[PDB]
Amino acid sequence: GHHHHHKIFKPEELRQALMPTLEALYRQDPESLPFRQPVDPQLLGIPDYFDIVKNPMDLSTIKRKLDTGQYQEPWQYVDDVWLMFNNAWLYNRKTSRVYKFCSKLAEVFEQEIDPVMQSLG
Ligand SMILES: COc1ccc(N2C(=O)CCC[C@H]2c2nc3cc(-c4c(C)noc4C)ccc3n2[C@@H]2CCN(S(C)(=O)=O)C2)cc1F
């Protein structure tokens, strides 16, 4: 998650600072592939997905929000990234490939976001 630590940012400043962290997620192949589009429960034959997951998130949604300047503060981007991870950890079993891939992306994200957040203050 995001955590407070003891500033209005322009959308282009956010995009510049944060986009590399998203790019690092997309670069993980094959780990990012299940996360690049919204989960489609009809194609996947999982009618209970939206019972468990009330607030879906994925990389395409995050990218669109960054691209269109929807995040006002870096913590909002960080929250959406963790939402995506937490949803995947919640729904899928720990034995599954997609859960393991989720964990791998979260490790990459933690490593990349930390120095960025320090900079942005
Ligand atoms: C590249 O990594 C994967 C590639 C394929 C798979 N899958 C299988 O191994 C078994 C067949 C179904 C497939 C698959 N499972 C997915 C699960 C999710 C998902 C996530 C994330 N959070 O909750 C759920 C449920 C998402 C996609 C899954 N897929 C494939 C991978 C890409 N597609 S698609 C065509 O819908 O974009 C479906 C799992 C993977 F982790």
Side-chain angles (χ1 to χ4, degrees), residues 1-6 9-14 16-109 111-121:
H2 163 251
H3 302 273
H4 180 65
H5 187 269
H6 180 90
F9 309 85
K10 292 180 272 294
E12 304 86 359
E13 279 167 343
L14 279 181
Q16 176 140 20
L18 297 173
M19 199 56 79
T21 71
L22 194 58
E23 284 165 7
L25 301 184
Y26 276 98
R27 195 168 68 228
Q28 306 312 304
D29 186 350
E31 289 77 10
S32 70
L33 297 192
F35 300 85
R36 285 174 179 195
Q37 55 293 127
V39 170
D40 183 344
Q42 197 163 234
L43 110 47
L44 292 173
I46 45 171
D48 74 335
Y49 182 76
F50 288 146
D51 273 60
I52 307 302
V53 179
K54 300 300 184 193
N55 294 293
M57 191 50 67
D58 71 299
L59 289 171
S60 71
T61 297
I62 296 171
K63 189 183 166 298
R64 184 179 319 118
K65 286 179 72 174
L66 241 200
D67 282 344
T68 56
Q70 287 184 50
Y71 299 115
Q72 301 309 296
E73 296 264 303
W75 67 262
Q76 295 165 321
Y77 164 78
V78 170
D79 284 351
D80 271 354
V81 171
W82 289 102
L83 173 58
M84 168 181 67
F85 298 150
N86 285 325
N87 283 347
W89 286 320
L90 186 63
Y91 185 79
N92 307 284
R93 302 289 191 282
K94 70 166 84 167
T95 54
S96 72
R97 193 169 202 219
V98 63
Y99 186 115
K100 292 174 196 298
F101 285 182
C102 185
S103 302
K104 288 289 184 173
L105 293 184
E107 292 163 353
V108 169
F109 188 64
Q111 290 162 42
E112 299 298 327
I113 200 54
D114 186 58
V116 176
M117 291 303 279
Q118 296 209 157
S119 297
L120 300 176

